[PDB]
Assembly symmetry: C3
Homo-oligomer: 365 residues x 3
């Protein structure tokens, strides 16, 4: 379905060396017009083996990075300082546009998987990367000027610079000592960084809204943390035990991008035929990206212990309506005399029915 | 025949309809002509039910801002943890957020309910979908959409039962005064206090009209008067002009105006500059009940009442909008210009001008 | 290879400009649509740049436009009178001044000066169709036609309350041309200029932060000022007018022989126009990952758009001065690649450096510490 992007069908390898890879999922709207309100958005997948580093670079696009697995040290250099942040799994952080930064995986046995929602600033849904370093894959951007102008600004004869400023591509392994070094400075998300409009925040920290023996629903919102406010986006980490299932529901106005972080699952989407109804389903493996419109009912059935993260675009004052179950049940709030009219079934017929499934949010399937 | 003229007769598309009512969409503002692309996101909808009827539960992926043109109605919005009932009357306007389930009832015995809605789609610009929950011979419950399997597992029932219980012709169905009285005694209405409420309906004409004189009345509610409007940056105005009278040539400062004729007729004249030196151009149109006519921002226009008229306006992009009149003693712009310039800009003595601009003593509404 | 005519960011005055009106007294030219010249910049479609110049002792006749404006008086003075429905404001502007004329606002410009022309740059922001507006003229001249003339004689009779002939004789003047003026820019005597010349308000150090009055760019001090150049910048966080627009304004002076060290904007798309001089500028961007060099030779009246995050350097071939409009300026940051202060590369942890470029901590702890000048340097 236009809403299912196969991690093997819709990714573009930006980089991959014996230390990792970097891919850019196609442009939502480029693939299908139905997702025209996602044009200025791109999903990026970053992975770096243990003991490596992303080389200093900056891009004309905002980044909301999320740490799915492993660890990492995110460092942002400013024109007057620099901040090294300690990012644990589930930790999130906003990396402004045109901000130079490097990534270090200070681990020895755990790979690092990280997803980033990209908000380009010049051309919609299209952005570039500007790497400072000079390598066999990329030429630093400094080398785009003339020897004379570089000569002048740096105060040195070109020769002296082209020898000091102009190593395998952009992902290189540091060394425990190197590693250890560039680390202590690092701050770290905490039990007191939800509101801080700069510090890193972890979604999987506060008690999850929908938690029940067959799964859990983690989410933080624009009204909760300022970084998300500026973007008007909510984030949700959902754990669903194999067998269990997410009761049918829909988002009031927020457009959702979900990315299976691990496991496999099933999804049903019911949108009107372009009056007949229509479904869109797909099995979801690891790394696939599914996008659920707004007010389009969907279900996620976990065919094996699963957890996926979801980006909620257009999330302010969003409301999640559950069609089945007890808590947050919408049809269950529709006056009886109307449930009567609404469906072909005795007023009670509907009622008693509605109160069979006695579990909230996640039921066993 | 001008680009800013959508005729009720061929600009609308009936969506659903039976002996009970009728719902229709006006075409896309942009599909008509590019000149109106800053309105691509907006869609106008008209809804009219006969007395004693209802709209089966449904939600649409579009932010709706509704206004009651005539008749009474009861609007109920259902939340995942609550329900709210509102008793609207003519002039009442509320904002149903997107993805909100709601049913509407016509509690009257002889007067039709004619409502007008402004659609603000959340997914595709200019195009939204109506997801109806009920199950009628005109639509398919958006639950039918799921799998025999999920439906069983979610509800904890054996499909062929829910298929019996959950899955009437049309969506606008007749109800009974009994049922009416039921779904009608727990509804709240738009007092004089809701005018600034962020959830309750607010009545337009409940407040003193901004402009008003012998031949007309100009009711308006802006984005700084109501939080709902402010979060859409839309302003609302309902104006009446007795037959014969006319709304003095004027023009909005920054708001694009969408105006629908409610009851009556009146011919309009909108001047603009040619398009491709300074070639002024006049688009005139003979309007009537239900016609739509947008007036871009900064374009002078005159509405000429040809029979007791009252249109309703949707003023897009209206924060700090300003309406300047090119006639009348009040809010006249041509008359705040310095004498040394209006004598220069006009082929007449800076005394010939003053003596012209001061002959019309009536303001806003004059007598054609 | 490099691009100099195939360099879309550069907008030659000689041809990327369209005249809207022109007669002995003045000229009004509308610069090309940025996205029309190249898809590269489709996030600037909502904008247009307009240039206006008027001879000494001239006046732009009464008119309202289908769009917002942010004028920046470069040289000469003027009086800008905004007329509302129940009021009117007369402003006195001098070089460096900037005022915001909201959409649908009628106003007329005057050049009180007897020996110097007024050169005004303007950023238009159309309200209806994107990247395109229209000018509505109240005045009736041999050139234009009052917009009041688009109505039918019957309505103008009704609305104004007079036999149409009377309206014709005092407002339009059709068929009595001699009684008309020719064009939207007319000339004046000194008494006229006087009668208009003063109910005016002017910029001041205390107008930096005002929602209505003109603020002087060069008034308050420069952000970067050194023996070889000066950088004046007034950001949204300082002035409301610029806040509701989310734009940053700046004026820089770079002496002949000096150059503005290679730097890049954090998130602001910058539209830079040359007000006086000849410059030589290089822009750097990616093409998989090939550093493409964009270069051009800019002189008076030249527009050059440099995308956000793209590093660039301006070279002063002659005493130069340009005016920059920084779009989406909220919180934007300026990152200097070369220089002592606000040098980004120099804040990188010693180690990352070593790995970044083919060198060594100290062989780099020094390379960059060689140029002991900041922001601006001699060539």
């Amino acid at each position: 379905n236009p809403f299912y992007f196969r991690s093997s069908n819709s990714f573009q390898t930006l980089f991959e060396n014996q230390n990792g890879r970097i891919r850019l999922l196609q442009r939502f709207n480029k693939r299908s017009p139905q997702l025209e309100n996602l044009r200025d958005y791109r999903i990026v997948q970053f992975q770096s083996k243990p003991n490596t580093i992303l080389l200093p670079h900056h891009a004309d696009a905002d980044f909301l990075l999320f740490v799915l697995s492993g660890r990492a040290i995110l460092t942002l250099v400013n024109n007057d300082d620099r901040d090294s942040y300690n990012l644990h799994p589930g930790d999130a952080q906003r990396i402004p546009a045109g901000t130079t930064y490097y990534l270090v995986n200070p681990h020895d046995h755990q790979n690092l998987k990280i997803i980033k929602l990209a908000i380009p600033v010049n051309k919609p849904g299209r952005y570039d990367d500007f790497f400072l370093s000079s390598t066999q894959a990329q030429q630093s951007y400094l080398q785009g000027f003339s020897h004379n102008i570089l000569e002048t600004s740096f105060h040195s004869e070109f020769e002296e610079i082209n020898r000091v400023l102009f190593q395998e591509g952009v992902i290189v392994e540091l060394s425990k000592e190197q590693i250890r070094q560039l680390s202590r400075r690092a701050k770290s998300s905490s039990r007191k960084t939800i509101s801080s409009e700069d510090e890193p925040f972890n979604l999987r920290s506060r008690n999850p809204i929908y938690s029940n023996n067959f799964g859990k629903f983690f989410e933080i919102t624009p009204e909760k943390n300022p970084q998300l406010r500026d973007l008007d986006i909510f984030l949700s980490s959902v754990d669903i035990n194999e067998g269990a299932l997410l009761l049918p529901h829909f988002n009031s106005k927020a457009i959702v991008i979900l990315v299976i972080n691990e496991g496999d699952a099933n999804i049903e989407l019911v949108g009107i035929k372009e009056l007949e109804v229509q479904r869109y389903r797909a099995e979801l493996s690891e790394d696939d990206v599914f996008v659920i419109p707004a007010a389009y009912p969907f279900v996620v059935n976990a065919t094996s212990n699963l957890n996926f993260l979801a980006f909620g675009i257009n999330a302010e004052n969003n409301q999640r309506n559950f069609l089945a179950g007890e808590k947050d049940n919408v049809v269950r709030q529709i006056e009886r005399q109307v449930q009567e009219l609404a469906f072909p079934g005795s007023a009670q017929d509907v009622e008693r029915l509605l109160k069979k499934q006695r579990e909230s949010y996640f039921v066993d399937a």
